[model samples]
Target: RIPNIATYTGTIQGKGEVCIIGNKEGKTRGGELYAVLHSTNVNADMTLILLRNVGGNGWGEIKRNDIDKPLKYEDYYTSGLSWIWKIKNNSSETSNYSLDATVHDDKEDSDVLTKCPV
Candidate 1:
């Protein structure tokens, strides 16, 4: 169960537990990537960074969330990347849902990246 990881580097913002959030700076290819934000009951929600490694079409998707706005990459799915952000329980009661994400770092904040960079 241990999955409430909201690690940050330059600026990934926060609140509490994001199930392994990252914006590392050592994956080469300009390093600095990791993305996810879900809402459907399992795949989780509220994670941002814009993901790096933009080399080819190994996988392509960057946004989702048709109900709320501000979240650019909505409706994205990449099994190879192993995404499990599913958070969907909108009808009234909501206290277990903590999602206030924000990551506007256009890279280059490589002060050497060290916040769980693994």
Candidate 2:
């Protein structure tokens, strides 16, 4: 069963479809990145939660959640960039997951990376 949004908070809860791309480092053959997506009605408060498994058995966890700040859009690019760095640095031969949250004017978006190996 799909998870439901418990707290309204003007947030629209749903799953996001995402394609995993290997960092500049490289990609794992037959491995995939796993992620979950979430969104909210609020624009500035929207976020994306990223998780990855960097150890034994390909487990994943929350890496980063991008919260809308007062900064301009260009300035916020760092948020996404930072997340990529985390994914690259924490990646391992074991399975891992990368999760992220994004905020939009009308909705929020989230994605994950899983089973990535370095």
Candidate 3:
């Protein structure tokens, strides 16, 4: 749920775009993208969301080299309601990439949620 509810979804590009669906429709608020890094800014597009902030420990949220890193992840409310997801793409030119902003909450397994820090 967003702002404790939903029937909403939308788009926002660069920077805070990832959270656009929630913020735009007044779904939810008070979240931030602390920091985002990529091996090459343009080459591999990285989308990020994490549970409250902690120390990076000099570790980046997303890292990829050869082969596309397939990952599933989310953002769990302190009260246990909503969520978010994963990684970078730089394997080859002919290769493509994507993201699914919404889904069946029960099917968390469909997405390989190694991490969902939003």
Candidate 4:
């Protein structure tokens, strides 16, 4: 179970974007990417999104479920794509969040994660 891990932790005041993974070389690789989100505020009026070039998809959300709820294992297919995290704060209050991103391939698992980072 070799997996590449990338973690991002910070506070968002309004709208922000951070590059979590970089795939500029378009390295040949494929696997499953997992994401977990943790927040400090229970009633946090914010939205965390994962942005990437999916073949047939768009943005992925981490928080915002009508209230507060820790998100777990938001997985997606990986094909040498750069991943970005976007924070959209809806309230006047600043929100804090941490994201744990993982990419795993059973066969060719080794330093593919080195190609992507904050």
Candidate 5:
């Protein structure tokens, strides 16, 4: 049996997108692709979250948040976040994948606090 560890909730504001592509031939044939873009007021030193599937890899950074006034895309604080994980097959196959991102406010808060960095 599994025990309930904790409760959680929060919100974020921004726009992000993802894309997927496949290869027609090669050892990594029929692999998938993905990408994302978002903004938050978490922190300047938090690690970027990433999730991936076969034959693909990518990364991102927080360009800006609410803390820095005069929102400017070019002068925002940023940190590097990236990951690459993939699986390939020859015949038509099915695969499952999932990716998630969040912020933790403290080192002892086992729960992922979508408002700060751990």
Candidate 6:
């Protein structure tokens, strides 16, 4: 299967948050997912989260936060089924943020994947 790349960039409104949905309406291709969150405000109280459903009626979470400096956070994990990346602006003022993520199957590595297919 082909790798899936997910990317999003926007300002998080004061006291608000945004979620980047990954294959929300389709079955996930089981593999590793790499994601990152970047912010410029040193005062930004932001939380980066990874959410996935892998059990009965419940969700799994992996969360990280940077409270006192410009943030460049990254994380990765193996997943299956549904997943999402959520960014929360826990600050009083709007926070500038960007997100990048990719999930690829292990069966065929990146060396064999290309932008144009035959």
**Top candidate by TM-score:** 6
Instruction: Quote the positional error of residue 12 for candidate 6 in Å.
Output: 0.7
Q: What TM-score goes with each of the models? A: 0.20, 0.21, 0.25, 0.46, 0.16, 0.53
Ranked by lDDT, top first: 6, 4, 1, 3, 2, 5
lDDT of residue 61 for candidate 2 = 39
In terms of TM-score, which candidate is stronger, 2 or 3? 3
Ranking by TM-score: 6, 4, 3, 2, 1, 5
Give the clashing pairs for model 4: none
Error of 4 at 20 (Å): 3.2
Top-lDDT candidate index: 6
Candidate 6 per-residue C-alpha lDDT over 1-118 given as tens digits, one digit per residue, 9 for 90 to 100? 2224333456677666444553311225422444566677767777766555545534446655443222233444343465545566677887776555454322332221111111
| Cand. 3 TM to true fold | 0.25
Expressed as tens digits, the lDDT of each residue in 1-118 for candidate 2 is 1122111112222222222332322122211222233322333333333433333424243544444211112222333332221232211222222222222213222322432232
lDDT of 6 at 19: 48
lDDT of 4 at 52: 56
Per-prediction tally of clashes: 20, 29, 11, 0, 4, 0
Residue 78 of model 6 has an lDDT of: 49
Q: Please give the TM-score that candidate 2 achieves against the real structure.
A: 0.21
Which parts of model 6 have CA positions greater than 4 angstroms off? 1-7, 22-31, 53-60, 65-80, 103-118
Give the runs in model 1 whose Cα sits over 4 Å from its true position: 1-49, 52-69, 82-99, 102-118
